[PDB]
């Protein structure tokens, strides 16, 4: 049943399903009609003539209101529902929409379906942190230079693909209703083809929050005429559908994002990994340095082996380099009188028992070297023979040799 497991049960790359991250989520907007209730006018072009139909926006009445909840709700072509900004909020004044996902998402697109005509100037912003600093994502304007200080119709540079680009595309006043602006995050980017191996673009698609700012709106130039009321009431920003498409950033180690104990969206990490985006590795799995999963290689986190003598292991870069990029996990504080990264070994003042293997608890027997008989405490590891002085025949240097008698001197214990 698990997508992370192969047919035999071997590890494989895990990707969460493609979702519209914007769907059903609360969006904070700067303006909404109805408080106080004001009149708005819909403009419609047919042939060579323009027609205007004026309606009222009442926040209290459900059929007359246009709340920010109408951006994220289900898009129905039969019954369209759009949010509407306050009347005539032309440049310098702007209308912004902040969307908070509350987790790192690998964004593929950001789309907007408009009820009113598309803006003359619009910009998409993202946040790496959860809303602290903002970095531009894409700009849309007639005058990229004068409005957003970016070159007009700039081609995507290989030198900086992590930079927001400005174009006059999708800014046209026509269609006056139903206009679409869909931003492709990997569009035109030269190394987008080798995305799995490109961390530069992997970071570019990453966003925790999305902010769309409407800076300048399209106008006919009739607002400055004798009657300002009728004209200025027919210019506003209205959006029916806001879609932020992309998969949950889990670095190829999770098939789904689940809400935890603190009600926070987190990846359900696999391949022996841990972290909100599976960026780090689960304790006691530091045998290999962390690496993002690719299509050909699973890049699972390798478990430590301490032969059940140590609870904590650490990664050594030098040992990983000496192993020829194979393994670098060294066990910490080896118990049961063992040594080595493998964690099986014997100690001085002690000798190995040949009847039982090295992995056994009673692998090292005590070397009871006589304090007056033997020269040193450290003995022979394979046979169990203490370093005897004056040719003592004893196994632990306890008995004098043939013809030798016990002496009072600490230097010469046996005298012939």
């Amino acid at each position: 049943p698990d997508p992370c497991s192969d047919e035999n049960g071997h590890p494989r790359r895990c990707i969460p399903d493609f979702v519209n991250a914007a769907f059903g989520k609360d969006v904070r907007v700067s303006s909404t009609c109805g408080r106080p209730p004001a009149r708005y006018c819909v403009v419609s072009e047919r042939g060579e003539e323009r027609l205007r139909s004026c309606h009222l926006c009442n926040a209290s009445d459900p059929k007359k209101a246009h709340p920010p909840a109408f951006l994220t709700d289900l898009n129905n072509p039969h019954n369209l529902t759009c949010w509407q900004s306050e009347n005539y909020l032309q440049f310098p004044h702007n209308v912004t929409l902040t969307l908070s996902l509350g987790k790192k998402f690998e964004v593929t697109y950001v789309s907007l379906q408009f009820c009113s005509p598309r803006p003359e100037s619009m910009a998409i912003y993202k946040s790496m942190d959860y809303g602290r600093t903002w970095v531009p994502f894409q700009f849309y304007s007639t005058q990229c230079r004068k409005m957003y200080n970016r070159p007009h119709r700039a081609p995507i540079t290989k030198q900086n693909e992590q930079e927001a680009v400005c174009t006059d595309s999708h800014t046209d006043m026509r269609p006056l209703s139903g206009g679409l602006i869909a931003f492709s995050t990997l569009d035109g980017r030269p190394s987008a083809h080798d995305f799995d191996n490109s961390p530069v673009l992997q970071d570019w698609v990453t966003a925790t929050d999305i902010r769309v700012a409407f800076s300048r709106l399209h106008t006919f130039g009739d607002e400055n005429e004798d009657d300002s009321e009728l004209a200025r009431d027919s210019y506003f920003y209205a959006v029916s559908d806001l879609q932020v498409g992309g998969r949950c950033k889990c670095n190829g180690h999770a098939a789904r994002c689940v809400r935890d104990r603190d009600d926070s969206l987190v990846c359900d990490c696999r391949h022996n990994t841990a972290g909100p985006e599976c960026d780090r590795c689960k304790p006691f799995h530091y045998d290999r340095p962390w690496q993002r999963a690719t299509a050909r290689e699973a890049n699972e986190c390798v478990a430590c082996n301490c032969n059940l003598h140590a609870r904590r292991c650490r990664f050594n870069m030098e040992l990983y380099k000496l192993s020829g990029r194979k393994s670098g996990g060294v066990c910490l504080n080896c118990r049961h009188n063992t040594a080595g990264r493998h964690c099986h070994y014997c100690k001085e003042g002690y000798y190995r028992d040949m009847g039982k293997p090295i992995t056994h608890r009673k692998a090292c027997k005590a070397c009871d070297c006589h304090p007056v008989g033997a020269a040193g405490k450290t003995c022979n590891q394979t046979t169990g023979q203490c370093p005897c002085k004056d040719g003592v025949t004893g196994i632990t240097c306890n008995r004098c040799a043939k013809g030798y008698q016990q002496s009072r001197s600490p230097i010469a214990p046996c005298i012939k």
Partner: protein, 66 residues
């Protein structure tokens, strides 16, 4: 010693239903006294079929109840 620990959740109205658990504290380690020097010059002198006299010396001896 064997301790019994109890956890209660409390507010302004009072103390809630308790959660119990017991534990036995680990014994304090005691340092072993440093050992003495064993006797030297141990010689067996056979006297008869049922009697052998044993003679030993002590380098520590220059009073004591040893």
């Amino acid at each position: 010693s064997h301790y019994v620990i109890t956890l209660k959740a409390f507010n302004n109205v009072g103390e809630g239903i308790p959660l119990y658990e017991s534990a036995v504290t680990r014994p304090h380690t005691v340092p072993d006294p440093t050992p003495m020097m064993p006797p030297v010059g141990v010689q067996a002198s056979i006297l008869s079929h049922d009697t052998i006299r044993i003679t030993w010396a002590d380098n520590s001896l220059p009073t004591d109840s040893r």
